[PDB]
Write a protein that binds this ligand. Structure first.
Ligand code: HEM
Ligand SMILES: O[C@@](Cn1cnnn1)(c1ccc(F)cc1F)C(F)(F)c1ccc(-c2ccc(OCC(F)(F)F)cc2)cn1
Length: 484
């Protein structure tokens, strides 16, 4: 009957890019107050159709394969970074199965092993990195936009790839990852390939790192066994065959490893950076966690080195802090699909034309007064309440569906959806919690920190993930239990 209201703009190309780009949530809210929950806005020559709130979550996440395409929207963002033939550079059925393959490395039995490895890496960083140097220093300053991206790549690599990779992680591979990371930008939506050096370094890093992985894949296939059913490389060695019998090439497997690492490390880097800062602003929250962790280990007759995956299950303060950080700082502010066939928006007369892009934003709801009281207050204790819990469950469907990587909720109508929903749902949620939880406990047990200001930095929405604005540091002291 009707196409959704288009948000007025003056600049013929730019559209609403400036405002949407600077502050996505504010922009959405201004648009909502004028037009309602469903509106369109022009962006770099593309028409973005937004559906705010839980009903929007349903509309986009649970949209039919035949109606919208995620790979149409993401191809240019990721393919040049990860490599060809995986993730968005393949049909959806291939993606579904790749997710299934990777999930075999993301189970409890693996996690139980990952935890000490992830802690060890953190501890090594504490001793060797100039931010900490805990054997020499007693006070210090940590730029969390340096420490967290680095710790996250060390812990994730050690965990998912194993010790060998950790072993070869010298400064040469450091440059590559930096060269590749620098190529992982929203600029790829607009400029995926250019002949200025930055791209050259990126393409070259992709080839080099994937080759490295390929070598390790082949080497392990032949001889390797550090320990049983350890990791992601083990998993893909075994689980590399599609349902039609087609098998991933070792180059494709390598490329999938890059995707998984890059996504996981980024989302985790930002999340840990954010909860270090927010905890700095509110140091008493640190002491709560500390108290909980220390009592727990006292029960146990142990020290931090005794802290297990199972222990992480007994620490609600840790897991509430991560929830709250993902509420206030979802790493993805926007999630796109391309409209491939005219969508009718149920409970309306609107029709979304083919060629539009549909945009869903759980972050909006996360940070909206409509769903969360005092949304801009960082309070992990809200997750012990009914209201918050109610915001985490989907009213309409408690039934579950399997898209090919295991059963997920059919219902996505929850205001709080940090890990998305439906077909393209995250598979890294539990791993993220294991990694972030270990990071958080290892920090809190050894250190206490504050921030210089009275406020956490403003978020930067121009990055691949929502990162803290550039000056972002914590000032740390040692806790009586500091291991060094
Ligand atoms: C705080 C941590 C993380 C957050 C907040 C997060 C968030 C998300 C979100 C919102 C999506 C849905 C994207 C969409 O619909 O377009 C997603 C998908 C995904 N995430 Fe994550 N993620 C996190 C960590 C990880 C980790 C650690 C891994 C890997 C181990 C991972 C791998 C994936 C994969 C494979 C997808 C699926 C993409 C698709 O099917 O199209 N994520 N993640
Ligand atoms: O969804 C990602 C990120 N992710 C999710 N979980 N972990 N990582 C992703 C998915 C699967 C992967 F294997 C690797 C990935 F990194 C992704 F595909 F790249 C992804 C897609 C979209 C976005 C994104 C979406 C919207 C953005 O807005 C910036 C703009 F407004 F355009 F300026 C900026 C970034 C970021 N990463």
């Amino acid at each position: 009957k009707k196409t959704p209201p288009l948000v007025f703009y003056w600049i013929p190309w730019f559209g609403s890019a400036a405002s949407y780009g600077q502050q996505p949530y504010e922009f959405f809210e201004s648009c909502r107050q004028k037009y309602g929950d469903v509106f369109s806005f022009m962006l770099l020559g593309k028409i973005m159709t937004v559906y705010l709130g839980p009903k929007g979550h349903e509309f986009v996440f649970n949209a039919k394969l035949s109606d919208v395409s995620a790979e149409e929207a993401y191809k240019h963002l990721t393919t040049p970074v990860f490599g060809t033939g995986v993730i968005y550079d393949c049909p959806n059925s291939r993606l579904m199965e790749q997710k299934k393959f990777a999930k075999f490395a993301l189970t409890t039995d693996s996690f139980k092993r990952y935890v000490p490895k992830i802690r060890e890496e953190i501890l090594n960083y504490f001793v060797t990195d100039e931010s900490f140097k805990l054997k020499e220093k007693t006070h210090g300053v940590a730029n969390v936009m340096k420490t967290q991206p680095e710790i996250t790549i060390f812990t994730a690599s050690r965990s998912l790839f194993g010790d060998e990779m950790r072993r070869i992680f010298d400064r040469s591979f450091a440059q590559l990852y930096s060269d590749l990371d620098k190529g992982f930008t929203p600029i790829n939506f607009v400029f995926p390939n250019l002949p200025l050096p930055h791209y050259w370094r990126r393409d070259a890093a992709q080839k080099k790192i994937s080759a490295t992985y390929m070598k390790e894949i082949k080497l392990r296939r032949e001889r390797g066994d550090i320990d049983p059913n350890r990791d992601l490389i083990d998993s893909l060695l075994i689980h590399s065959t599609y349902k039609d019998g087609v098998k991933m090439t070792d180059q494709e497997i390598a490329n999938l490893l890059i995707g998984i690492l890059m996504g996981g490390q980024h989302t985790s880097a930002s999340t840990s950076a954010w909860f270090l800062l927010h905890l700095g602003e509110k140091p008493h929250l640190q002491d709560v966690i500390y108290q909980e962790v220390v009592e727990l280990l006292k029960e146990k007759g142990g020290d931090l080195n005794d802290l297990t995956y199972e222990d992480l299950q007994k620490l609600p303060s840790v897991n509430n802090t991560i929830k709250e950080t993902l509420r206030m700082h979802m790493p993805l502010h926007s999630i796109f699909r391309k409209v491939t066939n005219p969508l009718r928006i149920p409970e309306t007369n609107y029709i979304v034309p083919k060629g539009h892009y549909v945009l869903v934003s759980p972050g909006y709801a996360h940070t909206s007064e409509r769903y969360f009281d005092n949304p801009e207050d960082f309070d992990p204790t809200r997750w012990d309440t009914a209201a918050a819990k109610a915001n985490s469950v989907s009213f309409n469907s408690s039934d579950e569906v399997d898209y090919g990587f295991g059963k997920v909720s059919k219902g996505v109508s929850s205001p709080y959806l940090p890990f998305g929903g439906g077909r393209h749902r995250c598979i890294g949620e539990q791993f993220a919690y294991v990694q972030l939880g270990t990071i958080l406990t290892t920090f809190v047990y050894n250190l206490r920190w504050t921030i210089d200001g009275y406020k956490v930095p403003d978020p930067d929405y121009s990055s691949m993930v929502v990162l803290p604005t550039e000056p972002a540091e914590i000032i740390w002291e040692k806790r009586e239990t500091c291991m060094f």
